[PDB]
Amino acid sequence: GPSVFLFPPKPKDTLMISRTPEVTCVVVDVSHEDPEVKFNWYVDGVEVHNAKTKPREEQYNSTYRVVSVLTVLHQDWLNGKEYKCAVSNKALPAPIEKTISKAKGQPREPQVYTLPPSRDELTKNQVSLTCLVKGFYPSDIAVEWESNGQPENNYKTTPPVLDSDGSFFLYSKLTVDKSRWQQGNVFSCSVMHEALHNHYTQKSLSL
Amino acid sequence: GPSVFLFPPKPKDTLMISRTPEVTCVVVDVSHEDPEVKFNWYVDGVEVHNAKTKPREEQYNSTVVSVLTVLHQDWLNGKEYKCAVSNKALPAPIEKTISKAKGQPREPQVYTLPPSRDELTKNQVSLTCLVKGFYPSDIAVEWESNGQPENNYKTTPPVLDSDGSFFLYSKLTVDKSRWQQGNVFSCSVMHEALHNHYTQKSLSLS
Numbered sequence: 500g501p502s503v504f505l506f507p508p509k510p511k512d513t514l515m516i517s518r519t520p521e522v523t524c525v526v527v528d529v530s531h532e533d534p535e536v537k538f539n540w541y542v543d544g545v546e547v548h549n550a551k552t553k554p555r556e557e558q559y560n561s562t563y564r565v566v567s568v569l570t571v572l573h574q575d576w577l578n579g580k581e582y583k584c585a586v587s588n589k590a591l592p593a594p595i596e597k598t599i600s601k602a603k604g605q606p607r608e609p610q611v612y613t614l615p616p617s618r619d620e621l622t623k624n625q626v627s628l629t630c631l632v633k634g635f636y637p638s639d640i641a642v643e644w645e646s647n648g649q650p651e652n653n654y655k656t657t658p659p660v661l662d663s664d665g666s667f668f669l670y671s672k673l674t675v676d677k678s679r680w681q682q683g684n685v686f687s688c689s690v691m692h693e694a695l696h697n698h699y700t701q702k703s704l705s706l
Numbered sequence: 707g708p709s710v711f712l713f714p715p716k717p718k719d720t721l722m723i724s725r726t727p728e729v730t731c732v733v734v735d736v737s738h739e740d741p742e743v744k745f746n747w748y749v750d751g752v753e754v755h756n757a758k759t760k761p762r763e764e765q766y767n768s769t770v771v772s773v774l775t776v777l778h779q780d781w782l783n784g785k786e787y788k789c790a791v792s793n794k795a796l797p798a799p800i801e802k803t804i805s806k807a808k809g810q811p812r813e814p815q816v817y818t819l820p821p822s823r824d825e826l827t828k829n830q831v832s833l834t835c836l837v838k839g840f841y842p843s844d845i846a847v848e849w850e851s852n853g854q855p856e857n858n859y860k861t862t863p864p865v866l867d868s869d870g871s872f873f874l875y876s877k878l879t880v881d882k883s884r885w886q887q888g889n890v891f892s893c894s895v896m897h898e899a900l901h902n903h904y905t906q907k908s909l910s911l912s
């Protein structure tokens with residue numbers, strides 16, 4: 500029978516008013532015998548109908564994949580409203596419902612600390628700049644690097660890790676040519692999180 | 707019908723001869739109606755019989771594990787371990803295979819980073835251990851001080867870096883008073899590409 504997957508908006512979308520956060524209800528494994536699928540959307544149990552269903556797309560394994568997108572208000576998501584996607588299909592014993600919401604719990608402000616490279620790493624051609632983000636809740640967060648206004652692309656960020664006190668932490672590693680760090684260039688770690696002022700903070704790092 | 711999941715040994719078990727590494731074959735959704743389950747194990751296609759099936763836990767939803775000890779060097783050399791599960795309530799037996807990640811093992815680079823000077827206005831400080839450039843991702847990280855283990859630490863999962871190697875960070879949290887006194891803390895890393903599968907990097911107030 501069919502399967503349903505419900506995806507939340509990206510952390511960055513809910514935190515910046517310029518962007519459009521969306522919850523996405525994906526239905527896979529819809530057979531040819533019964534291709535009609537209907538979506539009912541609910542916000543805290545109140546049915547809404549402003550969703551946008553996309554017309555079914557046959558996949559290469561002879562099954563139809565139907566996607567429905569519901570735009571959400573930034574403050575609705577941040578205020579913790581529940582979003583329920585009810586999927587009905589005549590080849591189902593009963594409709595399938597999935598619910599998604601922001602993690603429950605008191606939000607906490609990320610602490611952002613930039614750490615320079617260990618002196619051991621200076622014998623390398625490239626050095627690792629570290630951004631420690633700890634003590635934040637919920638785990639939805641975005642981390643970026645930049646220098647002199649332009650983005651740095653050669654960086655990787657760990658997934659959020661549950662800390663011992665119930666908050667989350669992560670590390671972000673920016674890799675630059677050792678020549679740039681030695682010159683004295685300034686690098687900045689950008690963090691977006693709901694518990695930040697303007698949902699944004701910036702911590703710089705230089706020799 | 708039932709499903710089968712096959713798990714590798716713990717990184718630490720394969721790297722220390724004193725420990726016993728094991729691959730674990732978990733069968734879930736075994737019904738009351740048909741409870742009989744069987745296991746056949748193979749090492750690179752050669753059937754072995756030293757496996758040991760351990761019984762047996764009924765679940766919170768009305769719904770069997772088999773363990774096979776392996777030689778440390780067999781796993782590290784990349785031999786295949788096959789768990790064939792037979793059940794009369796299956797259309798045909800389910801077989802799953804697992805092995806160590808393939809590729810040239812690479813040596814972890816281990817760097818200890820002191821706390822940011824901003825963090826000293828806190829009751830506790832964060833000691834950081836960067837482990838990068840290692841392959842495969844199987845690894846164990848521990849912290850200690852004066853020979854004894856530190857327990858209040860967390861380690862990120864391995865993250866695939868841009869060059870195909872992995873990195874992680876480990877964060878040890880200590881009372882700011884211990885760091886200020888000058889105590890020495892050590893980040894221990896176990897990995898197959900290290901000499902003696904082990905390296906240690908210290909960190910203290912400078």
Ligand SMILES: *[C@@H]1O[C@H](CO[C@@H]2O[C@@H](C)[C@@H](O)[C@@H](O)[C@@H]2O)[C@@H](O[C@@H]2O[C@H](CO)[C@@H](O[C@@H]3O[C@H](CO[C@H]4O[C@H](CO)[C@@H](O)[C@H](O)[C@@H]4O[C@@H]4O[C@H](CO)[C@@H](O)[C@H](O)[C@H]4NC(C)=O)[C@@H](O)[C@H](O[C@H]4O[C@H](CO)[C@@H](O)[C@H](O)[C@@H]4O)[C@@H]3O)[C@H](O)[C@H]2NC(C)=O)[C@H](O)[C@H]1NC(C)=O
Pocket residue numbers: 502504506523525527528558559560562564566
């Ligand atoms: C018929 O074919 C379908 C699609 O076929 C395609 O063609 C084949 C040849 C392959 O190339 C496929 O890769 C390709 O898609 C199959 O569909 C899939 O079904 C499976 C279920 O069996 C679905 O798995 C679920 O995936 C979730 C994650 O999905 C995101 O990421 C996927 C990449 O990893 C991506 O492919 C998806 O499209 C989806 O992308 C996100 O989409 C949303 C909205 O569109 C965006 O907002 C996000 O930004 C996207 N993210 C990214 C990173 O791009 C998993 O989370 C999920 O797991 C969860 O549930 C299980 C329980 O079911 C838990 O155990 C688990 O812990 C977790 O909680 C699950 O794995 C898969 O997504 C489907 N593919 C698509 C494209 O929808 C059919 O299975 C197949 N039918 C048969 C009978 O073979």
Ligand SMILES: *[C@@H]1O[C@H](CO)[C@@H](O[C@@H]2O[C@H](CO)[C@@H](O[C@@H]3O[C@H](CO[C@H]4O[C@H](CO)[C@@H](O)[C@H](O)[C@@H]4O[C@@H]4O[C@H](CO)[C@@H](O)[C@H](O)[C@H]4NC(C)=O)[C@@H](O)[C@H](O[C@H]4O[C@H](CO)[C@@H](O)[C@H](O)[C@@H]4O)[C@@H]3O)[C@H](O)[C@H]2NC(C)=O)[C@H](O)[C@H]1NC(C)=O
Pocket residue numbers: 709711713714730732734735765766767769
């Ligand atoms: C009734 O309730 C049961 C729970 O009590 C349900 O059992 C569950 O069944 C699902 C399958 O439907 C299993 O899901 C898989 O989990 C694998 C990971 O398993 C390990 O980690 C989980 C913690 O997340 C842990 O609960 C498991 O017990 C298992 O632990 C590992 O165990 C080994 C040896 O015992 C140990 O050495 C490891 O250290 C240990 N690891 C950890 C972290 O503890 C995933 O790998 C599976 O995913 C794969 O397959 C996906 C496709 O299906 C694919 O997309 C993925 O990428 C991946 O390849 C899968 O998610 C649950 O583990 C299992 N729970 C338990 C407790 O056994 C039962 O299904 C349910 N039945 C009904 C009818 O309701």
